[PDB]
Structures are given as structure tokens and as C-alpha cells.
Amino acid sequence: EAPAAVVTGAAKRIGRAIAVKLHQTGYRVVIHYHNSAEAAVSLADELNKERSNTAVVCQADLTNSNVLPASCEEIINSCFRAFGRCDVLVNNASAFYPTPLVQKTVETQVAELIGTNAIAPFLLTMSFAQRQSNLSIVNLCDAMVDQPCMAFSLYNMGKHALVGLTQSAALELAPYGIRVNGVAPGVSLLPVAMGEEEKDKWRRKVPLGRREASAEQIADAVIFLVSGSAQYITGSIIKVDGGLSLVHA
Amino acid sequence: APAAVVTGAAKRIGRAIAVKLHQTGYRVVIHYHNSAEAAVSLADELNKERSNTAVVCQADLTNSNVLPASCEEIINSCFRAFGRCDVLVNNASAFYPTPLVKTVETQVAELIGTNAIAPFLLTMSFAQRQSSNLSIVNLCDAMVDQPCMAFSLYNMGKHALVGLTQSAALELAPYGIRVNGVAPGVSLLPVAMGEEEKDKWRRKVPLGRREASAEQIADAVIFLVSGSAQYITGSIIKVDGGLSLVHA
Amino acid sequence: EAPAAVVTGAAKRIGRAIAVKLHQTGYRVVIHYHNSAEAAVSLADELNKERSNTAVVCQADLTNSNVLPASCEEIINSCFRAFGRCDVLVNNASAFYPTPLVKTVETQVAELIGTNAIAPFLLTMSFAQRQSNLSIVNLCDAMVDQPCMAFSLYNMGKHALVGLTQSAALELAPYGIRVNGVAPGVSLLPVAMGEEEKDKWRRKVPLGRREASAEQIADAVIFLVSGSAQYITGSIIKVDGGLSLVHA
Amino acid sequence: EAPAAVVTGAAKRIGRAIAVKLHQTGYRVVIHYHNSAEAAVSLADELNKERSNTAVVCQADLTNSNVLPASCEEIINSCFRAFGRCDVLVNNASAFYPTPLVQKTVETQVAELIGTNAIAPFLLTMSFAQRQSNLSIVNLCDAMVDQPCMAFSLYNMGKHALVGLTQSAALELAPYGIRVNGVAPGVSLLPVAMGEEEKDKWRRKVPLGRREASAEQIADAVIFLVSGSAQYITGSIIKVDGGLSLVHA
Ligand SMILES: NC(=O)c1ccc[n+]([C@@H]2O[C@H](COP(=O)([O-])OP(=O)(O)OC[C@H]3O[C@@H](n4cnc5c(N)ncnc54)[C@H](OP(=O)(O)O)[C@@H]3O)[C@@H](O)[C@H]2O)c1
Ligand SMILES: NC(=O)c1ccc[n+]([C@@H]2O[C@H](COP(=O)([O-])OP(=O)(O)OC[C@H]3O[C@@H](n4cnc5c(N)ncnc54)[C@H](OP(=O)(O)O)[C@@H]3O)[C@@H](O)[C@H]2O)c1
Ligand SMILES: NC(=O)c1ccc[n+]([C@@H]2O[C@H](COP(=O)([O-])OP(=O)(O)OC[C@H]3O[C@@H](n4cnc5c(N)ncnc54)[C@H](OP(=O)(O)O)[C@@H]3O)[C@@H](O)[C@H]2O)c1
Ligand SMILES: NC(=O)c1ccc[n+]([C@@H]2O[C@H](COP(=O)([O-])OP(=O)(O)OC[C@H]3O[C@@H](n4cnc5c(N)ncnc54)[C@H](OP(=O)(O)O)[C@@H]3O)[C@@H](O)[C@H]2O)c1
Numbered sequence: 001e002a003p004a005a006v007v008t009g010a011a012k013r014i015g016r017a018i019a020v021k022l023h024q025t026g027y028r029v030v031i032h033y034h035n036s037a038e039a040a041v042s043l044a045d046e047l048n049k050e051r052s053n054t055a056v057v058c059q060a061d062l063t064n065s066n067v068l069p070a071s072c073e074e075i076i077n078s079c080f081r082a083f084g085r086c087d088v089l090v091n092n093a094s095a096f097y098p099t100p101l102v103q104k105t106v107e108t109q110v111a112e113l114i115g116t117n118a119i120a121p122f123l124l125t126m127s128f129a130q131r132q133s134n135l136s137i138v139n140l141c142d143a144m145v146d147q148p149c150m151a152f153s154l155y156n157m158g159k160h161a162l163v164g165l166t167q168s169a170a171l172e173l174a175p176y177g178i179r180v181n182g183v184a185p186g187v188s189l190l191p192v193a194m195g196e197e198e199k200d201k202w203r204r205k206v207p208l209g210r211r212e213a214s215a216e217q218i219a220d221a222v223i224f225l226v227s228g229s230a231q232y233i234t235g236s237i238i239k240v241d242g243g244l245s246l247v248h249a
Numbered sequence: 250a251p252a253a254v255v256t257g258a259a260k261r262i263g264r265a266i267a268v269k270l271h272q273t274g275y276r277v278v279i280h281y282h283n284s285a286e287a288a289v290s291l292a293d294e295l296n297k298e299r300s301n302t303a304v305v306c307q308a309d310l311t312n313s314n315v316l317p318a319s320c321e322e323i324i325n326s327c328f329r330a331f332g333r334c335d336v337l338v339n340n341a342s343a344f345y346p347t348p349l350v351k352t353v354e355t356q357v358a359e360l361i362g363t364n365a366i367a368p369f370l371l372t373m374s375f376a377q378r379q380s381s382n383l384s385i386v387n388l389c390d391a392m393v394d395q396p397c398m399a400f401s402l403y404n405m406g407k408h409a410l411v412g413l414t415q416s417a418a419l420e421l422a423p424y425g426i427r428v429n430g431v432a433p434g435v436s437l438l439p440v441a442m443g444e445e446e447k448d449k450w451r452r453k454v455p456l457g458r459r460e461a462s463a464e465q466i467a468d469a470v471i472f473l474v475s476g477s478a479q480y481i482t483g484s485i486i487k488v489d490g491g492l493s494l495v496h497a
Numbered sequence: 498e499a500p501a502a503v504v505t506g507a508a509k510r511i512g513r514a515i516a517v518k519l520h521q522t523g524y525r526v527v528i529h530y531h532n533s534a535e536a537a538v539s540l541a542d543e544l545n546k547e548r549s550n551t552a553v554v555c556q557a558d559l560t561n562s563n564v565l566p567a568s569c570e571e572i573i574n575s576c577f578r579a580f581g582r583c584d585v586l587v588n589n590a591s592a593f594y595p596t597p598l599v600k601t602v603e604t605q606v607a608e609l610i611g612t613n614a615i616a617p618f619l620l621t622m623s624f625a626q627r628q629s630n631l632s633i634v635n636l637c638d639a640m641v642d643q644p645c646m647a648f649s650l651y652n653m654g655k656h657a658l659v660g661l662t663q664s665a666a667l668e669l670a671p672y673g674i675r676v677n678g679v680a681p682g683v684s685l686l687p688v689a690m691g692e693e694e695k696d697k698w699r700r701k702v703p704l705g706r707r708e709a710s711a712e713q714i715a716d717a718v719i720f721l722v723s724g725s726a727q728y729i730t731g732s733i734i735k736v737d738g739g740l741s742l743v744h745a
Numbered sequence: 746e747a748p749a750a751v752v753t754g755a756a757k758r759i760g761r762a763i764a765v766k767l768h769q770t771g772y773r774v775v776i777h778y779h780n781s782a783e784a785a786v787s788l789a790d791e792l793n794k795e796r797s798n799t800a801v802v803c804q805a806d807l808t809n810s811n812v813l814p815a816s817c818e819e820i821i822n823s824c825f826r827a828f829g830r831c832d833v834l835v836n837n838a839s840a841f842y843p844t845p846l847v848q849k850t851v852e853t854q855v856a857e858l859i860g861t862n863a864i865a866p867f868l869l870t871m872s873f874a875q876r877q878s879n880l881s882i883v884n885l886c887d888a889m890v891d892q893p894c895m896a897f898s899l900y901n902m903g904k905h906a907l908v909g910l911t912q913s914a915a916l917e918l919a920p921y922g923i924r925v926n927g928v929a930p931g932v933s934l935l936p937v938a939m940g941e942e943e944k945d946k947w948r949r950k951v952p953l954g955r956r957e958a959s960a961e962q963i964a965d966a967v968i969f970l971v972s973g974s975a976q977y978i979t980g981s982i983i984k985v986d987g988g989l990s991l992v993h994a
């Protein structure tokens with residue numbers, strides 16, 4: 001009787017915070033992960049301790065390939081196998097690294113950056129829709145998509161395609177009662193790899209508070225979009241960026 | 250308890266907004282221009298729920314030499330009644346055609362004054378008077394880039410209000426004041442509009458083929474003023490059932 | 498006969514460059530000015546010496562007031578009086594100064610919203626009413642969505658001018674009048690800016706770390722009025738050397 | 746001393762008009778094609794009759810695959826081999842067909858729609874920049890990207906990704922003096938098969954003239970962007986759509 005959600009890349013960081021807050025709201029969750037098996041299992045353990053049989057894990061690589069459609073079908077199928085329904089998909093998983101235009105193969109970079117950020121969402125969307133009373137999809141977009149980081153072409157291309165998907169799917173799935181929306185963080189949890197001085201450089205650019213968003217702040221916007229308070233919203237992308245996208249060079 | 254000002258609050262969307270903030274625990278100032286009876290009826294409904302948590306304030310928001318003083322008075326009414334003003338919702342709006350091919354300058358004063366200049370002056374007054382969670386929410390329009398034909402001045406006004414939203418979000422962020430917008434598509438249709446005409450619009454909406462309840466607009470407002478939106482500023486949330494996505 | 502154009506604010510800087518390039522393309526021009534009488538007359542003399550009877554001046558304050566509609570009518574009528582026709586309108590004149598949220602404010606509203614938005618609207622109404630390759634070009638701002646802090650009213654004006662561009666393109670398309678915009682980023686820097694502050698801006702521009710020349714801005718105007726843009730309406734061409742793509 | 750340009754999908758329609766107008770402007774051209782060899786050769790022969798040794802053809806499938814990077818390198822290399830320089834790249838080739846979310850494999854659809862519309866442009870852009878004065882790239886985008894055709898999600902995703910490329914590449918290449926811009930048609934040349942009654946349905950929606958753009962009208966915008974008159978323009982997309990994108994439902 002409790003609705004169920006799939007969250008991709010949910011073992012750590014923003015996707016973990018989304019899975020936790022959906023579970024706190026009443027959802028049963030599928031915690032998708034690729035490499036972070038220990039974190040995924042530990043989160044499912046923590047959730048199930050709170051309410052038994054309310055969390056499962058599902059491992060998959062969301063790089064594009066000729067098997068990606070089956071992997072995405074398997075993710076959605078894992079939700080139906082565990083819970084008998086699938087009410088919400090959150091497309092959160094994402095690869096991010098530089099792809100300079102001027103001096104892994106480039107075809108691997110294309111498969112990873114465009115696959116994870118764009119093609120996997122599209123196939124997860126297809127599978128979600130095909131397998132189908134408050135259904136909705138939330139794509140994690142990027143508030144800085146029109147002011148991109150230099151040398152991040154392929155990532156930027158994938159995030160723009162994800163906006164395209166959010167709009168196209170919102171239009172096509174509306175007659176089935178499925179809403180499709182986005183949440184677009186600016187700087188939220190910074191990369192684990194990034195040094196302290198660079199982290200502080202980013203934090204100082206943010207108008208509202210000179211700090212990054214917490215993962216929970218991003219999750220809060222996802223919660224709103226899946227809620228009954230958003231039943232007329234589809235095709236919308238909510239920036240959660242403390243004003244960063246409004247700041248000129 | 251926090252306190253909110255809602256302009257144009259006597260009817261329709263603004264009334265739904267004031268009702269929902271009140272339900273969330275806000276004390277409210279119900280601003281009205283011509284709708285005194287309706288404003289007082291709403292304040293009566295609210296104060297019967299919790300005594301002395303709603304007051305009314307009359308003002309014309311047409312631009313003129315006295316609009317700054319009227320806008321300062323609206324904000325002051327909140328501080329006098331409640332001792333604080335945490336939320337401003339700029340909801341009041343005039344809407345009618347202004348074909349390119351009332352004098353045109355009265356049309357300017359009404360369309361650009363209610364939809365843009367009054368919000369600007371209320372924003373300045375709200376900011377100047379300042380655990381708190383301060384925010385402004387501007388009622389925008391989801392169809393701003395696919396405008397209704399012969400509605401130039403209305404559309405100009407709504408574009409100006411997007412500019413205010415962004416400029417104010419940036420300038421007031423250091424003060425902890427967030428500024429955001431909600432952009433309805435087809436919501437409560439204009440009383441005048443004929444029945445067949447309304448139904449024409451409803452059929453174009455992807456989500457359900459009907460207009461948004463005022464309550465659906467209010468729900469987005471309530472989110473943006475909430476602690477669940479504390480990192481959000483300069484954002485405009487469309488609440489249009491997908492209508493802006495639909496090509497000609 | 499040669500076609501004729503009106504350029505507002507055409508005495509100096511970008512508006513002069515536009516008028517010169519339209520003249521070089523074969524147009525007869527009305528050089529609108531407000532305060533810059535010596536500059537306007539000097540430019541008109543230069544153009545008339547190149548080709549007799551092809552430039553006149555027209556003085557007008559474009560601040561909003563109850564007489565602005567008549568002033569806008571008069572500018573358009575000056576072109577028909579001098580040249581028998583008016584093919585192109587370029588809305589270039591603009592006021593720009595800070596209006597912090599924390600002259601009277603109503604004067605600031607009349608000047609910044611008047612010159613940047615209402616006078617373009619009324620000139621557009623007058624141009625259309627008085628009516629082949631007819632078009633209007635509005636000088637917009639590439640940084641509208643990433644505004645300078647404390648410039649709310651200027652940003653509101655330039656957003657309203659985007660609305661006008663789109664609403665007018667839609668409404669005037671059946672009359673064969675095209676309406677487009679050109680959006681500079683950093684072009685001619687303000688005369689009063691010191692070199693150190695000018696270099697701060699230059700260093701932000703990806704394409705050559707320099708501001709646009711006035712001629713570069715005029716080239717885009719010339720394209721949009723030309724027969725090579727005969728299907729373009731409602732479009733705003735950024736001419737900003739990539740500045741709008743640069744994150745904080 | 747004449748500059749040279751590559752135009753992809755140049756044998757017919759818009760790409761053909763672009764190649765013709767570039768040639769008229771004084772450019773030597775590489776006419777890329779995939780299936781339309783007779784038309785490509787016929788255009789090259791016409792152009793060479795106008796001025797000898799000013800046009801060559803280059804065949805390539807721009808579907809994404811292991812070999813697509815080498816193909817795109819070869820297209821750029823063809824221009825340097827023929828003409829000793831490559832000044833202008835126009836990414837015009839595009840696949841277009843529906844990909845409904847609800848009921849070719851779907852991964853073939855991904856490789857064709859996302860490869861032609863986005864990945865090939867990226868790889869061509871990489872190859873163009875690596876091999877390097879008025880250097881510029883022009884991407885043929887779509888004015889209706891934010892009000893998409895129902896059941897065209899992958900096409901829409903590909904065209905949004907191309908906007909991202911246009912912006913990301915403008916920023917990254919601006920230090921090399923390479924400008925990157927787009928031209929976004931609305932309704933231009935209608936599909937060959939389409940009945941007049943359906944073509945008329947589209948034409949009647951366009952505010953400016955109730956007609957589609959000619960190919961030559963699209964080409965005139967490309968010619969402006971590559972010209973000395975656009976030397977400060979980069980990262981810009983010029984809609985050429987007769988007001989169609991301003992029309993509400
Ligand atoms: N953090 C920010 O400031 C920020 C800013 C803008 C946008 N966003 C967007 O918000 C979302 C959450 O951001 P985040 O920083 O939490 O993300 P993240 O830590 O960089 O990545 C989220 C997860 O994506 C999964 N992932 C990566 N490559 C994968 C592949 N080939 N197959 C399957 N899964 C893969 C990883 O799972 P495993 O660990 O299980 O391998 C990873 O933990 C992302 O879509 C991001 O682009 C975030
Ligand atoms: N309804 C929709 O479908 C829709 C669609 C798009 C955008 N919106 C936006 O959403 C907001 C609410 O829409 P709505 O349909 O509820 O609005 P509405 O009924 O047209 O008007 C709201 C109130 O604004 C006040 N107002 C009008 N002119 C005024 C003036 N000169 N001075 C002071 N107040 C004045 C009136 O209050 P009094 O009655 O007291 O005179 C009016 O009741 C507006 O900003 C509108 O532009 C609504
Ligand atoms: N320069 C840039 O970098 C840049 C950047 C973004 C946008 N723009 C836009 O491009 C356009 C040209 O810019 P610019 O720097 O050449 O402009 P500008 O020098 O600041 O102003 C152009 C003219 O506007 C006229 N003007 C000012 N107030 C007026 C009033 N109350 N009534 C009538 N005319 C008035 C003045 O004419 P008189 O001298 O005759 O009084 C002035 O010469 C403007 O629309 C501007 O906003 C420019
Ligand atoms: N026509 C319009 O109304 C319109 C509207 C919006 C946007 N646009 C954009 O404008 C551009 C030109 O439009 P158009 O109507 O002239 O295009 P089109 O005729 O549909 O296609 C252009 C050419 O693309 C090449 N192409 C298709 N699949 C390919 C593949 N797998 N590998 C290599 N090349 C391939 C084909 O070349 P071969 O014939 O040699 O196989 C075809 O002749 C396109 O980017 C299009 O998306 C056009």
C-alpha cells in the first residue's frame with residue numbers, strides 16, 4: 001500500500017539524501033548503485049531497520065552500450081519485483097569529468113557522460129512508462145548548464161539533453177498521468193577530489209549565504225515535485241542554486 | 250507567528266494564497282483595491298479561526314506620484330498589525346489587451362504599474378523595513394515567451410517582473426531575503442471570458458485538459474516560502490500543466 | 498527612392514554607428530537626440546555632405562510622461578515629413594544608472610522604464626500605425642539574466658524590451674513588419690568609467706578579452722534590416738564575444 | 746588564398762543551399778554526404794564548372810559507433826588535403842524520426858539520432874580545432890526545441906545537446922579565435938513525402954507570411970555568421986523561424 005520509488009546513484013551524497021527523505025515520506029525505495037556496493041547495502045540496512053522490507057539495492061552500470069536498455073528495464077523491474085509497483089523514478093546518477101576539445105577513448109567518454117546523464121534517463125523513462133495515482137519522474141539537471149565549466153563539453157551536452165528529455169517526456173507522458181520535472185542544483189556537495197581552496201572559491205560565489213547547498217536542500221525540492229502539492233506541475237525545472245546562476249562573470 | 254502581505258488577496262488566486270498561508274500559521278494582510286466587501290469577508294473567516302491574525306489594507310497599485318507612499322503603507326500595515334513582515338506575495342495584476350494598431354498612458358500606469366512597478370516599490374519597502382525565513386514571491390506568467398496576441402503591455406509588465414525577480418534575488422541575498430516566482434498558465438479563467446473560449450484553453454493543457462485550481466498555485470507559493478526552499482532564490486516555478494511545452 | 502530609418506539616441510556612440518552604417522547602406526536617416534544637440538547636428542551635416550538631403554535631426558525626451566505618446570508620434574512623423582516614408586525604426590536610446598533597493602523614485606521609473614521600454618512601445622505603435630522591407634530593431638542587453646547588482650529598474654526595462662520584441666513580432670507579422678533585437682554584452686564602455694574598471698570588464702570577454710566596437714554592434718543591426726533576414730522576426734542576436742556564457 | 750568550408754549533409758535541401766551560398770561567397774567546399782552520392786557528385790560538378798577545383802565530396806555515415814571519431818577526423822582531413830586549410834565547419838546533417846516512449850532497435854535509434862545531431866558535431870568540432878583568419882563553426886539547431894513534437898524525444902535530446910555543444914565549444918575555442926554559433930530554423934523545407942494538406946497545416950501557423958523558410962533563407966543566416974560582419978558573435982543561436990516559436994498552443 002506504500003508507494004515505491006527508484007533512485008539512481010543513491011548510495012552516497014545527493015542520491016542518498018533523496019532516498020532517505022523519500023523513505024521518511026512513506027516510500028519504499030530501490031537504491032541503485034554502480035560501484036558503491038558497501039554504501040548501498042549499508043543504507044538499505046539502515047532503512048529496513050526503520051521499517052522492514054522497505055528498501056532493496058540494484059546494481060547497474062548506466063554507461064551507454066547495446067545492453068543499456070536491458071539494464072534500465074532491470075532497474076525498473078527490480079522495483080516491481082520487490083514492491084509490486086513503481087510510483088516515482090529519480091534520475092540522479094551522473095558521470096562528470098573534463099573532455100577538452102583540444103589536445104579512456106573518446107567513444108568511452110561519450111558512452112559514460114552521455115549515457116549516464118541522458119540516455120540512461122531516457123531508457124529508464126521508457127521502462128517506467130511501459131510498466132505502468134501520483135506517478136512522477138524527477139531528473140537531476142544542472143543550474144549552470146548555460147554558463148558551463150570550460151572543457152566539460154560532453155557533460156554539458158548530456159545535461160542539456162536531459163532538459164530536452166524532461167520537456168519531451170512531460171508532454172508525451174501527461175495523458176498517462178505521469179509528471180516529469182527537474183531539479184537543477186548549482187553548487188551542492190563539492191567533488192571529494194577537489195582541494196579546499198577550490199571548494200572555498202566556489203562557495204564564495206554563491207549569493208545566498210556564500211555556501212554550497214546541503215544534499216538535504218536538494219532532496220527537499222525533489223520531495224515537493226513528487227508530492228500532492230505539485231500535481232499540476234510538469235515539464236518544470238526548479239533551480240536550487242542560492243542565486244549562483246544569476247551572477248555575471 | 251510570522252506575517253505575510255498578499256496583494257490582490259480578496260479574490261481568486263490571491264485569496265487562495267492568503268488562505269493557505271493562514272492555514273500554515275501566518276498572520277496575513279489582505280490587500281485590496283476595489284474589493285472591500287470580499288476582503289473583509291475573508292478577514293472575518295480567518296479571524297474566526299484564530300483571533301486577530303488577519304487585517305485588510307486598501308491601496309490602488311496604479312503607478313502615479315503617490316504609488317511609493319501607498320506601497321510603503323501596505324508594508325507598514327503589516328509591521329503595525331503584527332510587529333514583523335516575513336513574506337511578501339506580489340499577486341495583484343491588471344490584464345487586458347493593448348493593440349499596437351482609457352488613454353494609452355493610463356494603460357501604461359495600470360499594466361506596468363500593477364504588474365511591475367508596484368512589486369518593485371513593495372520590494373524596496375519590504376527590504377528597507379528589515380531564525381527568520383524572509384522571502385518574496387512574485388506571480389509571473391508561464392506564457393511570457395509565447396504571448397497572447399495584442400497583449401504587449403501586459404507581456405512587457407510580466408517580463409519586467411521576471412527581471413525584478415532576478416535582480417532582487419541577487420541584491421537581497423546578502424540580507425537573507427529570497428525572491429522567487431510562481432508562473433501559472435491557465436488557472437482560474439477570467440470571469441468575463443465566455444464558456445466555449447475557456448474550454449478551448451482547457452483542451453490544450455497536457456496534464457488533464459483542465460485549468461489549475463487557485464489552490465494548486467497557492468501550493469507552489471507555500472513551498473517557496475517554506476523551510477524546504479531555504480536555498481532557492483531567483484527561481485520561477487511554472488505551474489501550468491505542461492501548457493508552455495505545447496507547440497502551435 | 499532610398500528607404501528611410503529612425504535611430505533613437507543616434508548622436509554618439511552605438512546609435513551614431515548604426516545611423517552611419519545605415520546611411521552607408523543607402524538609407525536616409527532621422528538622428529534622434531535628447532541633450533546631444535551639437536553632436537547630432539554635426540553628424541547630420543557629415544552625412545548630408547556625403548549625400549545631400551539624406552539626414553535630419555529630431556529632438557525628444559523619451560522619459561515616460563503623459564506627453565510621451567505625442568513625442569513618439571512626432572519622431573515617426575519627422576521621418577515621413579523629411580523623406581516620405583519610414584522603413585526602419587532602431588530603438589537605441591537608453592538611460593542607465595543604479596536604483597538600489599535598500600531624483601525621486603518615480604522620476605527614476607519614468608526615465609529608466611520610459612527610455613528602455615515604454616518609448617520603444619509607443620514608437621512601435623506609431624511606426625506601425627503610419628504604414629517593402631519594414632523592420633524594427635531594439636537594442637537589448639545580453640546580460641539581462643545575469644544583471645549588475647543595484648540596477649533593478651534598468652534590468653526591468655530591458656526585460657520589458659525583450660517582451661515588446663516578442664509581442665510586437667507576433668502582432669506585426671501579418672503587416673510584414675519584422676521586429677528583432679540586438680543584445681550587446683560589453684561594447685563601448687561608459688565615458689565616466691576609469692581605465693582600471695574598463696579593463697576589469699575587458700578581461701572577462703572570452704573572444705579577444707576586449708569590448709565590441711560600435712561598428713560590430715551596427716553590423717548586426719544592418720543584417721537584421723537587410724534582405725538576408727527576411728524570414729527573421731522575434732529573434733534577439735547576442736553580440737557579446739561569449740561574455741554571457743562565463744560563469745561567476 | 747580562398748578559404749575552405751566543410752558542410753555536412755550537403756547533397757540536398759538546406760545543406761545544399763548552404764554549400765552553394767558559401768561557394769558563391771568565395772569558399773572552396775567539401776560536400777559531405779551519406780546516402781545521396783548522385784546528388785552530391787552532381788553538386789560538386791556544378792560548382793567545379795563555375796570554378797575549377799573548388800568542390801570535392803566526402804562520404805561518411807555519422808551514426809555513432811567505434812569508428813565515428815576516425816570518420817570525423819577523415820572529413821576534416823579531406824578539406825585540408827583538397828584545399829590546404831579549413832576555415833568553416835557547418836554541422837547540418839541530421840536524422841529525424843519518432844521514438845515513442847510508449848508502445849530499428851532503440852540503441853540503433855540512439856546512435857543515429859544522438860550521433861548525427863550531437864556526437865558527430867562534437868567530434869567534427871574536436872577535429873576542426875585540433876587541426877588549426879576568420880575561423881568559425883555553425884551548428885544547425887531547431888527553433889522549436891522547447892516546444893517539441895510529440896514522440897520525438899531522442900531527436901529533441903540530440904538538438905538540445907547541440908545547443909550545449911554550441912555554448913561549451915564557443916567558450917573553450919574563443920581563445921583560439923574560433924567562433925561557434927547556431928542557426929535554428931522553424932519550418933523550412935517540408936519532408937518530401939508530406940501531403941500538401943499537411944504542409945499547409947504547418948505553413949498556416951507561421952506569423953510571418955504563413956509560409957516555410959526557403960533553404961536559401963536559412964543559408965543567408967549561416968553566411969552572416971561566417972562573415973566579417975559577425976566577428977564578435979560567438980555562442981549565439983539565431984532563430985530563423987518567421988515568429989513560429991512565439992505562437993502559443
Ligand atoms: N553536487 C553538485 O554540486 C551538483 C551540481 C550540479 C548538478 N548536480 C547533479 O545532481 C546529481 C547528484 O550529484 P552528486 O554530486 O551527488 O553526484 P555524484 O556523487 O558525482 O554521482 C552520483 C552517483 O552516480 C553514479 N554513477 C556515476 N557513474 C555511473 C555509471 N557509469 N553507472 C551508474 N551510476 C554511475 C555513482 O554511483 P556509485 O558510487 O554507486 O558508482 C555516483 O555515486 C547528479 O546528476 C549531478 O550531475 C550536482
Ligand atoms: N488566473 C490565471 O490563470 C493566471 C495566469 C497567468 C498569470 N496569473 C497571474 O497570477 C496572479 C493572480 O491571478 P488572478 O486571475 O487571481 O488575478 P486577477 O483576478 O485578475 O486580479 C487579482 C487582483 O489584482 C487586483 N488589482 C487589479 N488592478 C489593480 C490596481 N490597479 N490596484 C490594485 N489592485 C489591483 C484586484 O483586486 P481588487 O479586486 O481588490 O480590486 C484583483 O482582484 C496575477 O499576477 C496574474 O497575472 C494568473
Ligand atoms: N555600450 C554597451 O556596452 C552596451 C551594453 C549593453 C546594452 N547596450 C545597449 O545598446 C544601446 C546603445 O548603448 P550606448 O552605450 O551607445 O548608449 P548610451 O551612450 O548610454 O545612450 C545612448 C543615448 O540614449 C539617449 N538618452 C538617454 N536618456 C534619454 C532620454 N531621457 N530621452 C531620450 N534619449 C535619451 C542619450 O542621448 P543624448 O546624448 O542625445 O541625450 C544617449 O546618447 C542602449 O540601448 C544600451 O542599453 C549597450
Ligand atoms: N527543414 C526544416 O524545416 C528544419 C526544421 C528545423 C531544424 N532543421 C535542421 O536543419 C538542418 C538541415 O535540415 P534539412 O531538412 O535540409 O535536413 P534533411 O534533409 O532531413 O537531412 C540532411 C541530410 O542529413 C544527412 N544525414 C541523415 N542521416 C545521416 C547519417 N546517419 N549520417 C550522415 N548524414 C546523415 C542526409 O544525407 P544523405 O541524403 O546524403 O543520406 C540528409 O540529406 C538539419 O540539422 C535539421 O535538423 C531543419
Ligand SMILES: CC1(C)N=C(N)N=C(N)N1c1ccc(Cl)c(Cl)c1
Nearest residue numbers: 094095096186187188189190191202
Ligand atoms: C560533484 C559532481 C562532480 N558530480 C556530478 N555528477 N555532476 C556535477 N555537476 N558535479 C559537480 C561538478 C563541479 C562542481 Cl564545482 C560541483 Cl559543486 C559539482
Ligand SMILES: CC1(C)N=C(N)N=C(N)N1c1ccc(Cl)c(Cl)c1
Nearest residue numbers: 342343344434435436437438439450
Ligand atoms: C486571470 C487573468 C485575466 N488575470 C490576470 N491578472 N492575469 C492573467 N494572465 N489572467 C489571465 C488571462 C488570460 C487567461 Cl486565458 C487566463 Cl487563464 C488568465
Ligand SMILES: CC1(C)N=C(N)N=C(N)N1c1ccc(Cl)c(Cl)c1
Nearest residue numbers: 591592593682683684685686687698
Ligand atoms: C554604456 C551603458 C552605460 N549605456 C547604456 N545605456 N546601457 C548600458 N548597458 N551601458 C553599459 C553599462 C555597464 C557596462 Cl559595464 C557597459 Cl560595458 C555598458
Ligand SMILES: CC1(C)N=C(N)N=C(N)N1c1ccc(Cl)c(Cl)c1
Nearest residue numbers: 839840841931932933934935936947
Ligand atoms: C526535414 C526534417 C525531417 N529533417 C531534419 N533533419 N530535422 C527536422 N527538423 N526536419 C523537420 C521535421 C518536421 C518538420 Cl514539420 C519540419 Cl519543417 C522539418
